[PDB]
Swiss-Prot record, chain A:
Presence of the UniProt keyword Mitochondrion in the record: no
Organism: Homo sapiens (Human)
Cellular localization per UniProt: Apical cell membrane; Cell membrane; Cell junction; Lysosome membrane
Keywords: Acetylation, Amino-acid transport, Cell junction, Cell membrane, Disulfide bond, Glycoprotein, Host cell receptor for virus entry, Isopeptide bond, Lysosome, Membrane, Phosphoprotein, Receptor, Signal-anchor, Transmembrane, Transmembrane helix, Transport, Ubl conjugation
Membrane topology qualifier: Single-pass type II membrane protein
Listed GO CC annotations: amino acid transport complex; anchoring junction; apical plasma membrane; apical pole of neuron; basal plasma membrane; basolateral plasma membrane; cell surface; extracellular exosome
Assembly and oligomerization: Disulfide-linked heterodimer with a non-glycosylated catalytic light subunit (SLC7A5, SLC7A6, SLC7A7, SLC7A8, SLC7A10 or SLC7A11). Interacts with TLCD3A/CT120. Interacts with ICAM1. Constitutively and specifically associates with beta-1 integrins (alpha-2/beta-1, alpha-3/beta-1, alpha-5/beta-1 and alpha-6/beta-1), but minimally with alpha-4/beta-1. Interacts with LAPTM4B; recruits SLC3A2 and SLC7A5/LAT1 to lysosomes to promote leucine uptake into these organelles and is required for mTORC1 activation. (Microbial infection) Interacts with hepatitis C virus/HCV envelope glycoprotein E2; the interaction may facilitate viral entry into host cell.
Any single biological process term in GO: carbohydrate metabolic process
Record protein name field: Amino acid transporter heavy chain SLC3A2
Coiled coil regions in record: none
Domain of life from the UniProt record: Eukaryota
From Swiss-Prot, chain B:
Swiss-Prot/TrEMBL induction comment: (Microbial infection) Up-regulation of the complex formed by SLC3A2 and SLC7A5/LAT1 upon hepatitis C virus/HCV infection.
Chain positions found as Phosphothreonine: T2
UniProt-reported outcome of changing N215D: Nearly abolishes leucine transport activity
GO BP annotation list: alanine transport; amino acid import across plasma membrane; amino acid transmembrane transport; cellular response to glucose starvation; cellular response to L-arginine; cellular response to lipopolysaccharide; isoleucine transport; L-histidine transport
UniProt GO molecular function: amino acid transmembrane transporter activity; antiporter activity; aromatic amino acid transmembrane transporter activity; L-amino acid transmembrane transporter activity; L-leucine transmembrane transporter activity; L-tryptophan transmembrane transporter activity; neutral L-amino acid transmembrane transporter activity; peptide antigen binding
Regulation of its function: The uptake of leucine, tyrosine and tryptophan is inhibited by the different iodothyronines, in particular T3. The uptake of T3 is almost completely blocked by coincubation with leucine, tryptophan, tyrosine, and phenylalanine, or 2-amino-bicyclo-(2,2,1)-heptane-2-carboxylate (BCH). Methionine uptake was inhibited by the L-system substrates L-leucine, BCH, L-cysteine and by the MeHg-L-cysteine complex and structurally related S-ethyl-L-cysteine. MeHg-L-cysteine uptake is inhibited by L-methionine, L-leucine, BCH and S-ethyl-L-cysteine.
Tissues showing expression: Detected in placenta, in the syncytiotrophoblast layer (at protein level). Expressed abundantly in adult lung, liver, brain, skeletal muscle, placenta, bone marrow, testis, resting lymphocytes and monocytes, and in fetal liver. Weaker expression in thymus, cornea, retina, peripheral leukocytes, spleen, kidney, colon and lymph node. During gestation, expression in the placenta was significantly stronger at full-term than at the mid-trimester stage. Also expressed in all human tumor cell lines tested and in the astrocytic process of primary astrocytic gliomas.
Name recorded for this polypeptide: Large neutral amino acids transporter small subunit 1
Residues exposed to the Cytoplasmic side: 62-83, 148-149, 221-233, 303-326, 374-387, 436-464
Membrane topology, record value: Multi-pass membrane protein
Transmembrane spans: 7-27, 41-61, 84-104, 127-147, 150-171, 200-220, 234-254, 282-302, 327-347, 353-373, 388-408, 415-435
Outcome when changing P332L: Nearly abolishes leucine transport activity
Organism classification: Eukaryota, Metazoa, Chordata, Craniata, Vertebrata
Length: 471, 464
C-alpha cells in the first residue's frame, strides 16, 4: 500500500514453491534454536555447585550473652528488685544481646545447708509474680533468661563445704521446678569445688535436654589449663563452659593465636564459648588501651561471646574508691554514684557514651549488630594465617556469603602487616583489595577499598575488612 | 483485512489485572519499608499510590471513550499537540520504556522459578538470562499464532495469580487468628516514621512501580466488543480489586515478619513461605513465576498494538502495520517487540533505568490530561458517554506536576541525561518524517527491503 505491495499481487508472487520451503525452513530453524537455548540453560544449571545445608542453629548461637551478677548494683539503691529490672530491657535490646544470666536469687542464709532452699526467691528481690512478669516481659522483647543456681552464693565455698550429696540432689530438684516455671537455661559456677563434678554435670545436662532441645546449661571454672578443661568435656559435648583459660596472658598476640588455635584443635572445632572469666569484668585483666582490641576479637571468633555488665562501657572498680571489686555500680547517669559526688565524668556513663561515635559503647553496638546478622559470622568457618611479629590475623567464611578478615595488633610498636596466607583453601583466598568496616582507633575512612600489601597498623589497632565470594 | 473485535469484558479485566499484578508485590515492599521507616507510613504509601492510580485511570476511561481509537496515550497527544511531540513520546516508549519493563518481569520470573533449586544461594545469572529469553520468545510465538490463544493464556494466569495472592492473604489472617499479634498492635505501629518528603517521594516511586500498566487497555482498544460500556466497566471493576489485594498482602506480610527481617531480606515471599509451610514451601516462588509470566504476556500484547498504530500514522516504517491474512495477527510488530526486548539481556542491571525516566512518564501522562481539558473547551462537537466530574483531572495534574518537580530537585543529574536521550530522537524525526522528497538512492532500497519482509512473513496491508 504505502511503501510495499498489496494483497493479491503478493499472494500471486509469494506463493511459489521455494518460498513455502523458505518459510517452513525458517519455522523449523526457530523451533530448533529455542530447544538449543533450553538445553543450554539445563546444562548450565546441572553444572552449578549446590549450596550447603544450614546447620539448624539454636538461640544461643545467634549473639552474645550478658551476665548480671549483682542485681542491686545494676540499677541502684532501693530499686534493686526484679520489678526494676523490667525497665532496663530496652537498653539490653539496644545491645542486641540474646540472653541474660540473672544472678542467684534464691533464699540462702549462710553455710547452714538446711536453711538453703533453691525453690524460694529471697524477699529482697521480690516474689514469684514479679519473676514471671519479668519472664514474659523479656519474652516479648525476644530475650531469653538464664537463671544462675550456685547454692552458697554468699559464703566462701560456693558448694557448701558439707557433702555435695544433699546439695547435689536439691540442685536436681530445682531444675524440674524452674523449667516449668518457664526459664530458658541454667548456670552453675565454681565447679572446681564440686567433687566428682564431671559426673554431676552429665545428669543435669540430661535433665535439661530431657525437657526441650531449646535449653542451655552453662558451667564455670577458674581453671586456666587446657587438660583440666578438656576432662570436663569428655562425655558432655553440648555444655557451655566459661573459664579463665583466655585471660591469663596478653602481652603478645602470637601467644593468643596459639591459645585459640590449640583450643580449637583439641576439641575438634565444636561449639564453644569465649570469655575472659566466669564472673569478672574485662578490666580486671586488661589495661584500658586493650579493651577495644578484645571486643573486636570476642565478637568474631567461632562461638558464643559472654560478657558481664559494664564491659560495653569499660566499667572499672579501680576508678571509683570505696566500692567492692566484685560488684561495681553501673554508671547510668551522672548522678549514679552518690558517694564522692564529682568523681564520675561524662565519658564514663551510658548516657554520655550514647552520643560519641568513637566511644566504647558505640563500638559494641556495631559489633553486636554485625554478629547477629551476617551468616559467615553466625556459623562460618575459621582460618588463622601467619603474619608479622605480633599480629593475629584470621578469616571467617561460610559458603558464598561475604567473607570477613580480622587483623589485630596486640603489640605496642607500629608495624606492617605482611598478609602472606598461602594455606587458606581456594574457596576463601583473599583478593588484592578489600573494604573496611571499622577500626578501633579513629583516623581512617570506613568504606574505601584498601589494599593488602601496604597495610600498616598503629599501636593497638584492629581492622574488620571485607570481601565477597569470587575468584 | 483489519485486525478484529474479539476482546470481551472479562478479557479486559484479565488484561488489566494480569498486567498490573506482576512482580512489584513480591519485590518492592523492602524498598518502601526502607525509605518510609515504619510499617504505618509504608501502608499509607501503598494506599496513596492506589487512589492516585484510580483517579488517573478514571480520567483515561473518559479520554478513551472520547477519542475512541487504538494506541492510547499516543493517539491522545497526536490529536491535541500534533505530530512532533507524539513522535517523541512514541520514540521513548519504543526504545526504553516497553522493552525494559518486559525484560525486568521476565528476569523476575526466571529467578523466582529457579529459586527452589538454590535455596540459600544466588541463582546463576546466565541460566536466569536464558530462561527469561525463553519466556519472551515463547509468548511471542503464542501471540503471533492467534489472538484468542493469548486471551486464554491471560485468563488462566490472572486466575492463578489471584488464587496465589488469596493464599498469602488468608495465611496472614490465620496468623492474626492464632492470637500472637506482635506487630500491628495499635500503639506501636508508627515508630521510625521519619519525615522529609525528599526521601518518601522515592518510596512513592517504588510503590508506583507496582501500579504500572493501569492504562494498557487504552492501548488495546479498537479490539473490544462494544468499547463504550466495556472499557469504563473494565477499568472500574479492575482497579479497586488491585489496590485492595495490595494493601491486604502488605498487611499479611507484616503479620509474620519483623521490621529488620524485612529490611535485611532479599525475598519477603520466600520468608513467608518458609515460616508458614516449611515443607511444601516450594509453592510460593512457583506462583511468583506464574504471576510474572502472565504480566509479560499482557505487556507484549499491548506493545505490539502500539507500534502498529504508530506505523499507521507515518511515524514508523510501513512494514509494521501489516497484517498477515488468515491468521489475522500483526506479525512484524510482534517480532520487533520481541527483538527489542531481547536486546536488553546485555544489561548488567537495568533496574536503574527507572528513576532516570519516570519524570517523562508522568510528564506525558499529565500532558494527555491537559489536552483532554483543552479539548473539552476547544472542541465541544464530540459525544461523551462518560463525562467525568472536573477537578479530579485538576488534582491529578497537580499531583503529577508535584512528582515531576520533586524529581528534578533531589536528583537533577538523573533527569539531565534523560532529557538528552529524549531529545536524541529529533534527528530521527526530521530524517524520517520531515524529509519527504527523499533522495532516489534510498526509496528503492526501502521498497526492496519492505517487499522482502512481506514475502518472508506473508503480510498484507490493512484494507477492507
Ligand atoms: C528488527 C527486525 C524486526 C522485523 C521487522 C522489520 C522491521 C524493520 C524496521 C525497524 C524500524 C526501526 C525504527 C525506525 C525509527 C525511525 C522511523 C522513521 O523515521 O520513519 C520511517 C520512514 C517511513 O517511510 P515509509 O516507510 O516510506 O513510509 O522510513 C525510513 O525512514 C526508514 C529508515 C530507517 C530504517 C532503519 C532500519 C534499521 C533496522 C533494520 C532491521 C532489518 C530490517 C530488514 C530485515 C530483513 C533483512 C533481510
Ligand atoms: C508454565 C506452563 C505450565 C504453562 C506455559 C504455557 C504453555 C507451555 C504453552 C504451550 C502451548 C501454548 C498454547 C498453544 C495453543 C493454544 C490453543 C488454544 O485454543 C485454541 O486453539 C483457540 C485458537 C483458535 O483455534 O483460533 C487454548 C490453549 C493454548 C493457548 C496453549 C496454552 C499453553 C501454551 C501457551
Ligand atoms: C526468525 C525471524 C527472525 C524471521 C521472521 C520469520 C518468521 C518468524 C517465520 C516463522 C514462521 C514463518 C510462517 C510460516 C507460514 C505462515 C502461514 C501459516 O499457515 C497456516 O497455518 C494458515 C492457517 C489456516 O489455514 O487457517 C503458518 C504460520 C505463518 C504465518 C508464519 C509466519 C512467520 C514465519 C514467516
Ligand atoms: C542420660 O544418662 C544416662 C546415664 O547417665 C544415659 O544412659 C546410658 O549412658 C551410658 C553412658 O554412661 C551409655 O553407655 C548407655 O548406652 C546409655 N543407655 C542408653 C542409651 O540406653 C543416657 O544416654 C542419657 N540420656 C540421653 C538422652 O542421652
Ligand atoms: C580456683 O580458686 C581457688 C581459690 O583461690 C584456688 O585455690 C584452691 O582453693 C581451694 C579452697 O579454697 C583449695 O582446696 C585448693 O587446694 C586450692 N588450689 C590449689 C592448687 O591449692 C584454685 O587454685 C583456683 N584454680 C586454679 C586452677 O588456679
Ligand atoms: C593440632 O593440629 C595439627 C594439624 O593441623 C596436628 O599436627 C599434626 O599431628 C600429627 C600427629 O600428631 C603429626 O603426624 C603431623 O606431623 C602434625 N602436623 C603438623 C603440621 O604439625 C597436631 O597434632 C594437633 N594437636 C594435637 C594435640 O593433636
Ligand atoms: C574522659 O575525658 C577526660 C577529658 O578528656 C579524660 O581525661 C584525660 O585523661 C587522659 C588519660 O586518662 C590524659 O592524658 C588527659 O590529659 C586527660 N585530659 C583532661 C582534660 O583531663 C578522662 O581520662 C576520660 N575518661 C576515660 C575513662 O577515658
Ligand atoms: N506492575 C509491574 C510489576 O512488575 O509489578 C508490571 C507491569 C508493568 C508495566 C508497565 C510499567 O511501566 C514502567 C514504569 C511504571 C511506573 C514507574 C516507572 C516505570 C518505568 C520507567 C522507565 C523504565 C521502565 C519502567 C511497569 C510495570 C511493573
Amino acid at each position: 500500500k504505502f511503501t510495499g505491495l498489496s494483497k493479491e499481487e503478493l499472494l500471486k508472487v509469494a506463493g511459489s514453491p521455494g518460498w513455502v520451503r523458505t518459510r517452513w525452513a525458517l519455522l523449523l530453524l526457530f523451533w530448533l534454536g529455542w530447544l538449543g537455548m533450553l538445553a543450554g540453560a539445563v546444562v548450565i544449571i546441572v553444572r552449578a555447585p549446590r549450596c550447603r545445608e544450614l546447620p539448624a542453629q539454636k538461640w544461643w548461637h545467634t549473639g552474645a550473652l550478658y551476665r548480671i551478677g549483682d542485681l542491686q548494683a545494676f540499677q541502684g539503691h532501693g530499686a534493686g528488685n526484679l520489678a526494676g529490672l523490667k525497665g532496663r530491657l530496652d537498653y539490653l535490646s539496644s545491645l542486641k544481646v540474646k540472653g541474660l544470666v540473672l544472678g542467684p536469687i534464691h533464699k540462702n542464709q549462710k553455710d547452714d545447708v538446711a536453711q538453703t532452699d533453691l525453690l524460694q526467691i529471697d524477699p529482697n528481690f521480690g516474689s514469684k509474680e514479679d519473676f514471671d512478669s519479668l519472664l514474659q516481659s523479656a519474652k516479648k522483647k525476644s530475650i531469653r533468661v538464664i537463671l544462675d543456681l550456685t547454692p552458697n552464693y554468699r559464703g566462701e565455698n560456693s558448694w557448701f563445704s558439707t557433702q555435695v550429696d544433699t546439695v547435689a540432689t536439691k540442685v536436681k530438684d530445682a531444675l524440674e521446678f524452674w523449667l516449668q516455671a518457664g526459664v530458658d537455661g541454667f548456670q552453675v559456677r565454681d565447679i572446681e569445688n564440686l567433687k566428682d563434678a564431671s559426673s554431676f554435670l552429665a545428669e543435669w545436662q540430661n535433665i535439661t535436654k530431657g525437657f526441650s532441645e531449646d535449653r542451655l546449661l552453662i558451667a564455670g571454672t577458674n581453671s586456666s589449663d587446657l587438660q583440666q578443661i578438656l576432662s570436663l568435656l569428655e562425655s558432655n559435648k553440648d555444655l557451655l563452659l566459661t573459664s579463665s583459660y583466655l585471660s591469663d596472658s596478653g602481652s603478645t598476640g602470637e601467644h593468643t593465636k596459639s591459645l585459640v588455635t590449640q583450643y580449637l584443635n583439641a576439641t575438634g572445632n565444636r561449639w564453644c564459648s569465649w570469655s575472659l572469666s566466669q564472673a569478672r569484668l574485662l578490666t580486671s585483666f586488661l589495661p584500658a588501651q586493650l579493651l577495644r582490641l578484645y571486643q573486636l576479637m570476642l565478637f568474631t571468633l567461632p562461638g558464643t561471646p559472654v560478657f558481664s555488665y559494664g564491659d560495653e562501657i569499660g566499667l572499672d572498680a579501680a576508678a571509683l574508691p570505696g566500692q567492692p571489686m566484685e560488684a561495681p555500680v553501673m554508671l547510668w547517669d551522672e548522678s549514679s554514684f552518690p558517694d564522692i559526688p564529682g568523681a564520675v565524668s561524662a565519658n564514663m556513663t551510658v548516657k554520655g557514651q550514647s552520643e560519641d561515635p568513637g566511644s566504647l559503647l558505640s563500638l559494641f553496638r556495631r559489633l553486636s549488630d554485625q554478629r547477629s546478622k551476617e551468616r559467615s559470622l553466625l556459623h562460618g568457618d575459621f582460618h588463622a594465617f601467619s603474619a608479622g611479629p605480633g599480629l593475629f590475623s584470621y578469616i571467617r567464611h561460610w559458603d558464598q556469603n561475604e567473607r570477613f578478615l580480622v587483623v589485630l595488633n596486640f603489640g605496642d610498636v607500629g608495624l606492617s602487616a605482611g598478609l602472606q596466607a598461602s594455606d587458606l583453601p581456594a574457596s576463601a583466598s583473599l583478593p588484592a583489595k578489600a573494604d573496611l568496616l571499622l577500626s578501633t582507633q579513629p583516623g581512617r575512612e570506613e568504606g574505601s577499598p584498601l589494599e593488602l600489601e601496604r597495610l600498616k597498623l598503629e599501636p593497638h589497632e584492629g581492622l574488620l575488612l571485607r570481601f565477597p565470594y569470587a575468584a | 483485512v483489519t485486525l478484529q473485535r474479539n476482546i470481551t469484558l472479562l478479557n479486559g479485566v484479565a488484561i488489566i489485572v494480569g498486567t498490573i499484578i506482576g512482580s512489584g508485590i513480591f519485590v518492592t515492599p523492602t524498598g518502601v519499608l526502607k525509605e518510609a521507616g515504619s510499617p504505618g507510613l509504608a501502608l499509607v504509601v501503598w494506599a496513596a499510590c492506589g487512589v492516585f492510580s484510580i483517579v488517573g485511570a478514571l480520567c483515561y476511561a473518559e479520554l478513551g471513550t472520547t477519542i475512541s481509537k487504538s494506541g492510547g496515550d499516543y493517539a491522545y497527544m497526536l490529536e491535541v499537540y500534533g505530530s512532533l511531540p507524539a513522535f517523541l513520546k512514541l520514540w521513548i516508549e519504543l526504545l526504553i520504556i516497553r522493552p525494559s519493563s518486559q525484560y525486568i518481569v521476565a528476569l523476575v520470573f526466571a529467578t523466582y522459578l529457579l529459586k527452589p533449586l538454590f535455596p540459600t544461594c544466588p541463582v546463576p545469572e546466565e541460566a536466569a538470562k536464558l530462561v527469561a529469553c525463553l519466556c519472551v520468545l515463547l509468548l511471542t510465538a503464542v501471540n503471533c499464532y492467534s489472538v484468542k490463544a493469548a486471551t486464554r493464556v491471560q485468563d488462566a494466569f490472572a486466575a492463578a495469580k489471584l488464587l496465589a495472592l488469596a493464599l498469602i492473604i488468608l495465611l496472614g489472617f490465620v496468623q492474626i487468628g492464632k492470637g500472637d499479634v506482635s506487630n500491628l498492635d495499635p500503639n506501636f505501629s508508627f515508630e521510625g516514621t521519619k519525615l522529609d518528603v525528599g526521601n518518601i517521594v522515592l518510596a512513592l516511586y517504588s510503590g508506583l512501580f507496582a501500579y504500572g500498566g493501569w492504562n494498557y487497555l487504552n492501548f488495546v482498544t479498537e479490539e473490544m466488543i462494544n468499547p463504550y460500556r466495556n472499557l469504563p466497566l473494565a477499568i472500574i471493576i479492575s482497579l479497586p480489586i488491585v489496590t485492595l489485594v495490595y494493601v491486604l498482602t502488605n498487611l499479611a506480610y507484616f503479620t509474620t515478619l519483623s521490621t529488620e527481617q524485612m529490611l535485611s531480606s532479599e525475598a519477603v515471599a520466600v520468608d513467608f513461605g518458609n515460616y508458614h509451610l516449611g515443607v511444601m514451601s516450594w509453592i510460593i516462588p512457583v506462583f511468583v513465576g506464574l504471576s510474572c509470566f502472565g504480566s509479560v504476556n499482557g505487556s507484549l500484547f499491548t506493545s505490539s498494538r502500539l507500534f502498529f498504530v504508530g506505523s499507521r500514522e507515518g511515524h514508523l516504517p510501513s512494514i509494521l502495520s501489516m497484517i498477515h491474512p488468515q491468521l489475522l495477527t500483526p506479525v512484524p510488530s510482534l517480532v520487533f517487540t520481541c527483538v527489542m526486548t531481547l536486546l536488553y539481556a546485555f544489561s548488567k542491571d537495568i533496574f536503574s533505568v527507572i528513576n532516570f525516566f519516570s519524570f517523562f512518564n508522568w510528564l506525558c501522562v499529565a500532558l494527555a490530561i491537559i489536552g483532554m481539558i483543552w479539548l473539552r473547551h476547544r472542541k465541544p462537537e464530540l459525544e461523551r458517554p462518560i463525562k467525568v466530574n472536573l477537578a479530579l483531572p485538576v488534582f491529578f495534574i497537580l499531583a503529577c506536576l508535584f512528582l515531576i518537580a520533586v524529581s528534578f530537585w533531589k536528583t537533577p543529574v538523573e533527569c539531565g541525561i534523560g532529557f538528552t536521550i529524549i531529545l536524541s530522537g529529533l534527528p530521527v524525526y526530521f530524517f524520517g518524517v520531515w524529509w519527504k522528497n527523499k533522495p532516489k538512492w534510498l526509496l528503492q532500497g526501502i521498497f526492496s527491503t519492505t517487499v522482502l519482509c512481506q514475502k518472508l512473513m506473508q503480510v498484507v496491508p490493512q484494507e477492507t
